[PDB]
Amino acid sequence: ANRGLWDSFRQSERGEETIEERFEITGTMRRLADQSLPPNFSCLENFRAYVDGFEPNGYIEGKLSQMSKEVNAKIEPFLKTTPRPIRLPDGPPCFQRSKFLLMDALKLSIEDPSHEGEGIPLYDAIKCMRTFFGWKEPYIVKPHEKGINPNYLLSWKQVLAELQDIENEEKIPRTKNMKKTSQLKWALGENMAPEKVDFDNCRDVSDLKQYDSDEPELRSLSSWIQNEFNKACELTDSTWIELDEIGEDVAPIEYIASMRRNYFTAEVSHCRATEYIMKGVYINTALLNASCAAMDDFQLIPMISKCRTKEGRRKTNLYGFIIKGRSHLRNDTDVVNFVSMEFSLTDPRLEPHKWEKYCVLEIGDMLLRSAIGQMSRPMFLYVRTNGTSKIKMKWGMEMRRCLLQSLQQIESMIEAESSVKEKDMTKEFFENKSETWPIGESPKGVEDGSIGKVCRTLLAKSVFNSLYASPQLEGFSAESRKLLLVVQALRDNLEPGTFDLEGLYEAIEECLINDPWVLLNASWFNSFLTHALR
Amino acid sequence: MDVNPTLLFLKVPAQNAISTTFPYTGDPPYSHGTGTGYTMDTVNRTHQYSEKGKWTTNTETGAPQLNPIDGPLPEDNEPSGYAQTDCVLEAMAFLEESHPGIFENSCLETMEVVQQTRVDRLTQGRQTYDWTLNRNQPAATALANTIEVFRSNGLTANESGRLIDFLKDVMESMDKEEMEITTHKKKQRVNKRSYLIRALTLNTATPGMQIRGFVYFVETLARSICEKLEQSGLPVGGNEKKAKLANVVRKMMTNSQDTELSFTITGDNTKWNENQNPRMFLAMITYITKNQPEWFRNVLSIAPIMFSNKMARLGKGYMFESKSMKLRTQIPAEMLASIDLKYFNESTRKKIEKIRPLLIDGTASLSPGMMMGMFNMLSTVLGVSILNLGQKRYTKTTYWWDGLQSSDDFALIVNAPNHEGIQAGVDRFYRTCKLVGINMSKKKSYINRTGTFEFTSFFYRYGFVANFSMELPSFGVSGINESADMSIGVTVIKNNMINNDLGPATAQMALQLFIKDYRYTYRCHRGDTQIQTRRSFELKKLWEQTRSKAGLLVSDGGPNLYNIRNLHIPEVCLKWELMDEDYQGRLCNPLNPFVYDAVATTHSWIPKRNGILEDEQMYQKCCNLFEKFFPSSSYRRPVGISSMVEAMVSRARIDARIDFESGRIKKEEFAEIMKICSTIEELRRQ
Amino acid sequence: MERIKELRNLMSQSRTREILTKTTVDHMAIIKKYTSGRQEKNPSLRMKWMMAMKYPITADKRITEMVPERNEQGQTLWSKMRVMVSPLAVTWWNRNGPMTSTVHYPKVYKTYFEKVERLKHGTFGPVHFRNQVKIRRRVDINPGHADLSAKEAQDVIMEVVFPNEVGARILTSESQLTITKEKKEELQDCKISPLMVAYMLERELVRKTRFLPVAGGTSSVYIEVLHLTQGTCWEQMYTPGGRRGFLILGKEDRRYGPALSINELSNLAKGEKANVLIGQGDVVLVMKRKRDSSILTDSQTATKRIRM
Amino acid sequence: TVSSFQDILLRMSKMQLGSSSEDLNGMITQFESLKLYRDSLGEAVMRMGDLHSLQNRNGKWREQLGQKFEEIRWLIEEVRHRLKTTENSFEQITFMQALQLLFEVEQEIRTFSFQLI
Amino acid sequence: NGKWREQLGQKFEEIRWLIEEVRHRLKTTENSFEQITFMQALQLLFEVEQEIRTFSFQLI
């Protein structure tokens, strides 16, 4: 019994004999079984006998012989003149849809905090606000063309007044709850909630539609997404990331790994994509905590990041504010609404089509100390209504896997080449300064760069993939991977071929509806195709 | 300069930087499954692919069924589910001929698995559809509810603790004229046909509870067969797959008397699930089990019979709205068979119009096809036979082929003296596959000379077989305590290095990120740091009073000594020989009030935790009460012949008498314990 | 006292009585699995939220007599509503607290302590970059103990850790394994935990094997450093460096007194008979022996009775 | 020896230019590493460590500790008695300051001696 | 002075392995240029090994 044999042994004595097992159909299952056979049979026993008395004579050959010749798989060759550019859709230009704006943001620094100062974000935001003079009377310079703009003006004024009115309190609060006002109620959509009843009473009503089953609009490609990507690959004057330590190294392979990761970290430490990563992590964590803590209040949440300066001083930065609605989240799909306010120095009237979901105000003037003398430039504010998720919060809280992925890609490229030339090629990648890689385009032709540039480019690509997730990206990636493999096979002198080339294309275009990142990727693929076979 | 990373491929080959194409590092935050919209499309399409079959009406359920077997041969290149019994049987016979003794050893190895399995096996897996509540529940709850309902109606045969008895009782249940369901006190009645329908429905697909036990044995037998074939790459994973890809290319490139050509193909199959048919599975099972005892045949043949006549649940329904009164409502699918079609749009209208004949009690009938997943290792076996048919002795011509084939992805290599032979071989393979019920996707396949191909995200260049089929680790905190998280993290990193292809440089940065997260979560920073938390004063005092600062754990102020070479060693054993005597005595003191290769320590604490059955935790109480009498039950399974109450009472009496004799406790409570035991014995007499 | 009064009211309810009366000891592990299947509600976030609260962990009542309520800073270390305590209490204990000798630790965790000795006293060689093919063999990750099979390792563990719950076999044989005597002599007054000791002994004494794609050494020493030696396109060279005779007459009798315990068979006599609880519940009548009853050639001598 | 290094390196480079072998490249890398290690070892050879300062005056320096302790509490008791006896204010403040100074300096000396041994 | 004592360990193994590899390559070649190169190699290896051993003995 210690092994698992006592039960079968005990259930095997039928009086004075021994029976191994018993199992019968005997009933409804018999009738169900008799109806699960090929059409020329009636009983299971006859089918079993026919299967038992089977010998293969000539069946497959005869069936193949009596089959039509229209069923075939003919190969058509893939030549240098075969491929054609992918077709992109046409229509009105596309617009911005990120959670926080990237290229057009400025900061209000508290500069150095005391090294022992660890405090509440509200007072850090207030101290950052105090160091600025130059507010004016706000007014609208670009309307939302959908909604009421005076509500936006009143919301900004109320935020400023409620931030100033802290001093009328006996005790200092830890968090700020906004008053439930008409304009804030309109902005957060607290009075457009449909009411739910049973179908029986509303059977005879009229003007009832199924749902928002409408064909998506088609939009073309603009020139601002390329500008954003260009700016995202540059270097800054801060650090934005400091990693911990590990033990000392002994084995040679540890030395090689340490040198690889040290070069990579030194090259990608000061990039702007790291700032985007930190911004996303902080904002999402704060907003999730506020949603879980306060459930029936209009809470004010600041936008804050931290970094280390060139000289070695800690700094704190402020980007704007977020006002949260009501958060009663039972599952991971429920949506919480909010409104966002951000500072900027970019004039909205140069590219009005980029900002289609925004209302822009003018709030003050800024003094610039650059070069000789002092000059003043206007300051603006961007306001918008949005509501994200509970899952996408967790998605935003994990953005260091982009760093992990970039390091893995670089290491894989090194390791692939280390196997053909059977030596160690990590020194020939980084230390050598005469190596150049094609990573750009210009009216003159194809340009070149250094290893740090390709590292930062890969990191930026990973970050932008994280920030613009959609199924179109998946479909395009798969189909483009297939086409790229076929083109490489052609370039390697291996005489490739295809069975149906029109269908692959048709899939590529049908996965190209509306998103700007996907359209930029398609344009990049077309530009690659025009050079790889010419 | 305008920067785009795609032009990096003009200098680096595609296979060297193919990892730049995959965009994600995890599961994206959106869903594409959809509800009732896609199920109707699936049903309509799988019925479209086999229109020319034979229509019949069920005599035990009352549902239409379609039989496409032995239908007309196809005339175009569109997918067609018209298979022939003769071809399948001949392919199986030739597979048996090529590898003599492959079908008997599997049956003998599977019989002992069948005859010894226990009932606990059904509690492992994902969520399972529950017929007693018309929802989804974890496996344990579903099994418990099914047992409760079964015992309520006189079907008590699973008390033997054997899976086969549970299956016998399920078959007996399926042959009754009345069923009763009591909910905690409603008491609903279900007739024969309604219960039969509810015992054949599939979710939108996890199975039911009356069908998993039969699927398990079939999967076991299929795995046993697949383990003995070299053309199957499914059960293996890792370096074994790399060896499998290397061996076929080595075999086909012997280049003896080199006057012959070689070509390879990367291919996919279109509409895999909705072109299979359970009848061919039944035929395969029947052929496999020749010259075997009859009960084994019945047990292995039960499941395809149930699949051959199954019901598909639609979903939750539709949501409507009004643009004037600010109103919204939900339409269940149970009343979808009779509502007027003026409300819906064009697509939904035609969908509903086409789906109406196949609708019974909110579920549609779907005989011809496999829903989703399931029977993977049997479809692989069916696929491997066509590859086996490519030997010289069976083609009887100049060309011949071989390859390896997974559940849905395949690679094939063809050899011929000229181009015409290669074309003829490809055509014959295509036609033979279409003869059995497998369709090849033309728009997702290409052909080139041998030297480069792909198989399930395993990219093969001239000698390098880099793979990208798995994702990166989590490098986060598990959430048990401050002694179990370190071991889990380092073990995960080590296992990913060993099994997958995680590089050495990436492991170090993963360790760095894990340490950062650990320190932030548990508020344990180094003693010589300016970060202020609630735990800083104690850490600084301990740091100041300590002589050897390299022997303190990371949990309390110490630095980390981990690197690649010592990821397999526990932390305490690693730092043992560098810490002070008093620190050792305090830390490893087995009388603490507080208490994957970890030592006990004072850091292993526990945090604060926050119908059918009247109480759902009734077995657990009886279980936990047992170890208080027999502490060894937590280490190994007990063995005995008596009941639980006998052992408990006997041990209690013995312990009470020994305690009284030793004088540890006075005489007052001895009589009380004796009378309580006598009362328990009296209540047991009923 | 508490356990018997908890058992008393379980049989009061009719539904639990059927379970307690219709279930054999052999089927306890079968019903143990019917617990639940849904708990993973993002454990990392839960732990992060729980560490923010004060008093997040639990301890026994006697902590209030060993740890002061406040420290020199003036911070609360525990609160009264098992009681609730804070991590500061654990740090305080590690800083100030009673000390005990740790001489038994290197004998309970020696399988871990040999690994560090192997790693420290080892030497390294060069690294080669090339391509190689890996094949599969049978590898042993736990070497086990020589002259001991998997059948008697469990017996040894049960005798050492749980002397009162051995039954039938081990209790009727006439022998005594040597290793049992030393294990029982050394671990005379260790108070770590029965379960931890049992797991560690099982890990030390029991051999278990698996399948691995090894391209180098085969011995158990080379398997534990498999993540340091091999790679996708490189290889690193490294050398490690370095109980009397009894019989069952039947079930319990009411004419020979109450049942006894296994550890109280020491007194006994020269052939009396008494009933005892052996294993996990069985009570049987036993008696001392008068002959040898060995397994010598006498079994084969029966062949004279056949083939005349 | 160095001349042998560069000559043999050039010879292997020429040999490898005409044919590629795994071992050839391996020995090339190993020879480069060995030459660098020899150069660094020779750079350490013509400098050594500073053993001259490692054998400085240390003998009696270990024994004047007891001599100083001999006169520590003697002078502290002398100052105590003189402070008790005296009657000016100048002398009183001077002796109080001296007592403080000796307390601090003797504690410093004891701590330094305890740390070093 | 602790790090050098552990590089010394790895240098001896490198020298030994390269000695056997070059000896085998010498045994398996049939071109006078290669044997001249390998003669020069073996001489250099013997000299450098002796010097490293002497320096290692001096360090302790």
Author numbering:
A (entry chain A): 183 to 716
B (entry chain B): 1 to 184, 207 to 226, 242 to 632, 657 to 671, 681 to 756
C (entry chain C): 1 to 81, 88 to 248, 691 to 756
D (entry chain J): 5 to 121
E (entry chain I): 62 to 121
The authors write:
Genome transcription and replication of influenza A virus (FluA), catalyzed by viral RNA polymerase (FluAPol), are delicately controlled across the virus life cycle. In this study, we have solved the cryo-EM structure of FluAPol in complex with the viral NS2 protein in which NS2 is dimerized to stabilize the symmetric FluAPol dimers in a highly ordered barrel-like hexamer.
Interestingly, in the context of the FluAPol-NS2 complex, full-length NS2 formed a pseudo two-fold domain-swapped dimer, which was stabilized by extensive interactions between the N-terminal domain (NTD) of one NS2 protomer and the C-terminal domain (CTD) from the other protomer (B and EV3). Further structural analysis revealed that hydrophobic interactions and hydrogen bonds are responsible for the formation of the domain-swapped NS2 dimer. Further inspection of the cryo-EM structure revealed that each NS2 domain-swapped dimer binds to two FluAPol complexes, and the terminal helical hairpins interact with the PA and PB1 subunits of FluAPol. In addition, residue Q111 of the C-terminal domain of the other NS2 protomer forms a hydrogen bond with residue S558 of PA. If we superimposed the polymerase protomer (Pol1) onto the previously determined crystal structure of apo H3N2 polymerase, the NS2 binding has little influence on the conformation of polymerase except that the flexible loop between residues 550–556 of PA subunit could now be modeled and stabilized by the interaction with NS2. Interestingly, we found that the NS2 interaction site overlaps with the binding site of CTD of Pol II.
